[PDB]
C-alpha cells in the first residue's frame, strides 16, 4: 500500500527522485522552462551534476514527509501552505502539480514494482484541491 510505497521510495530516495523527476521533465518539456540551469543538457549530463541531485533528493524527502502525515491520501492543510508559501513556488499554479503526478503515477505503473498506483493518483489530486484551498491559482 500506500505506507509501504513511502518506506520503498525513501529507502533509495535519491535514485527515485531523480527518476522521477527526468520522467517529469521529458514528458513535458515546456515545465523545464522552470528550470533554467537545467536546459540543454541530456538525463545523463543532469544526473552527473551534483547539483541535480541534490535539489531532487531535497524536493522529494519534504514530499514524503508530507505523504507521511496525510490521512487517508488526504494531506494536511498546513503542508498544503507550507507549498504555496515557500518563495521558490512563486509563480506556479495547480496544473504544474497535476502534470507532477500524472508523470508520477505514470513512472508507477511503468516500474516494476508493486506500488499502489491509485493511492498516488488519489493522493496527488487531494493535493491540488488542497493546494488550491490554501491560496494557489
Ligand atoms: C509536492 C510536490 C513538490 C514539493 C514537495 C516541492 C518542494 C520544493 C522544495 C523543498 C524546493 C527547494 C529545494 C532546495 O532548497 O534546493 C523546491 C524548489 C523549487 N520547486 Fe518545488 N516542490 C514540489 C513541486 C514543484 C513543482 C510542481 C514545480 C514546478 C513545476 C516546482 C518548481 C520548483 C522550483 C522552480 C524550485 C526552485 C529550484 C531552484 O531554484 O534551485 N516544485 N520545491
Not at 32 to 40: A, H, I, L, P, Q
Not at 83 to 104: D, I, P, R, Y
Amino acid at each position: 500500500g500506500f505506507k509501504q510505497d513511502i518506506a520503498t521510495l525513501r529507502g533509495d530516495l535519491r535514485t527515485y527522485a531523480q527518476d522521477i523527476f527526468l520522467a517529469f521533465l521529458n514528458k513535458y518539456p515546456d515545465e523545464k522552462r522552470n528550470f533554467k540551469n537545467y536546459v540543454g543538457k541530456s538525463d545523463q549530463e543532469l544526473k552527473s551534476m551534483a547539483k541535480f541531485g541534490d535539489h531532487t533528493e531535497k524536493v522529494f524527502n519534504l514530499m514524503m514527509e508530507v505523504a507521511d502525515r496525510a490521512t487517508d491520501c488526504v494531506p494536511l492543510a498546513s503542508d498544503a501552505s507550507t507549498l504555496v508559501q515557500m518563495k521558490q513556488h512563486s509563480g506556479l499554479t495547480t496544473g504544474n502539480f497535476e502534470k507532477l503526478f500524472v508523470a508520477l503515477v505514470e513512472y508507477m505503473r511503468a516500474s516494476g514494482q508493486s506500488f499502489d498506483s491509485q493511492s498516488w493518483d488519489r493522493f496527488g489530486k487531494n493535493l491540488v484541491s488542497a493546494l488550491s484551498s490554501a491560496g494557489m491559482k
